[model samples]
Target: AQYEDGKQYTTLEKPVAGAPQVLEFFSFFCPHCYQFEEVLHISDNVKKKLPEGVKMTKYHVNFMGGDLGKDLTQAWAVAMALGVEDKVTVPLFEGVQKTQTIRSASDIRDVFINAGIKGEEYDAAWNSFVVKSLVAQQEKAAADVQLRGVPAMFVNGKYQLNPQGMDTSNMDVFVQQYADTVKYLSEK
Candidate 1:
């Protein structure tokens, strides 16, 4: 049950210092990430267990949805900018992965529109330089990590959570242990 470096976690060559940060790398098209959000609530659970002042942020990976992957990433940034993530995230995941209905930026835009966000508001965020740079940075972060899979996480920009050493057969155990590892690393 020991969390060993390179087994339970890996040290990043570039570590972000200051307050503890938990960075979650995922894609809306990832089935595992969808399940992590719907069934297990892993992100929220982990956030709840984090130490004081530790911040948890989610990053959308750009390797899954092909050219549309970047669109999905932009969608995420827009949601974050407009504070509509709670209203938009699950629907996007459902449309992209579950139903396979989302095909273009229009479809992505409608998801935000349905979330009660105005078209102009969505467009403002979508075209804003701030969101553009945020999306660019998200893509950069994904590339920097060179993730082999989705739904991965890192603490303090280093200390990535390793799935190899943990048991996934049991849902509750994995979530508990995951939060434990995050908290342990965050405090370190």
Candidate 2:
């Protein structure tokens, strides 16, 4: 249970999970989160390398976009419910980070619609019990972790990888190390 403190990662008191899980907390409105997804493709890359049963769960932090923050989180949950996350992830990021056009829940709905999901389907998922519950769960999850920033990663719900200690100068090495770190933490 010993990690180089202030180096690779820092352990937490959240109580390790009974199974392996990687929780990623990020906000669509965060430029760094955008870069992590768009520029580095860290999430997808790490996902590909994760060991069996190590599920990666992304929680869209809902504290960055003023009134639209929670709406965006719900929108992400909607996409997740509809299984269209791969289709809408970048568009959502672009709308929030590049064009600055996402202002309300309707705007997020429009993004999902433009991503080939039917408006009716989007509406249904937006209002579904499961998606709503997921949004609420994500909110509580963020709060429980004392989330202070975006693009934060935790393994087994207890070990938070240190971004400052990570190698960020190169894309390949960073992604590999990031995945390796999660894999390493999962075994603990």
Candidate 3:
């Protein structure tokens, strides 16, 4: 699904009716989340094992509300709204990870523009309905979930609250286990 960065949640490009949804709660500034991205990208094993229709979605968690987080959030929301989520999402993540310099909304915008997304279209998407809805959902999730940190994964609505117990050192394994749990829940 398309989304706007500043907004809340982006819908999956493909719908999953009875499929279990794996929502990965992450932060742009978190090192763990940065490291985990590679595992997420490479692991097709979990996807292959997932129950029919099960899918994963990434949610950018804005724990620290400030210019940096806000800007990144806006970038995410704008990409989703503009229908270039797949194009810009991973790039934004990589850009932030590779550069030690702090990333801001304008910085991310430049990245998006450089990647062929028109400035005007990006602006319009940022203010669209999907962006608005996503922002609202994010706010609710942050508050209700009592989030403590970034790189948290929630199976359906259940969170992997304890990172240690989940063996977070191995992100691919952790993600695979989470997917398995989600499939079980979806069937129930």
Number of the top candidate by lDDT? Answer: 1
Q: How close is candidate 3 to the true structure, as a TM-score?
A: 0.71
RMSD of candidate 3 to the true fold? 9.0
Tens digits of lDDT, candidate 3, 1-188: 11122122222333323322665567677777766665464224445666657676566666654677767766666765676767776676677767644466667778788889888887777767888787666656655555677776555554343434444667667766555544444453
Root-mean-square deviation per candidate: 1.9, 2.1, 9.0
- Give the runs in model 3 whose Cα sits over 4 Å from its true position: 1-20, 40-45, 159-163, 166-178, 181-188
CA shift of 156, model 2, Å: 0.5
Each prediction's number of clashing residue pairs: 0, 0, 19
lDDT of 1: 0.85
Scored against the true structure, residue 171 in model 2 reaches a CA lDDT of 76
Candidate 1: Cα lDDT at 38: 91
What TM value does model 1 have? 0.92
Model 3, residue 28: C-alpha shift (Å)? 1.3
lDDT of each: 0.85, 0.82, 0.60
Candidate 2 accuracy as lDDT: 0.82
Which residue pairs does candidate 1 place in steric collision?
Answer: none
lDDT of 1 by residue, 108-170 (tens): 999888889999989989999999988987877776666778889987777888867888999
lDDT of 2 by residue, 102-162 (tens): 8788888888778889978888888899998989888888877778988898887788888
What is candidate 2's CA lDDT for residue 55? 76
**With candidate 2 superimposed using the best TM-score fit, by how many Å does residue 172's alpha carbon deviate from the native?**
1.8
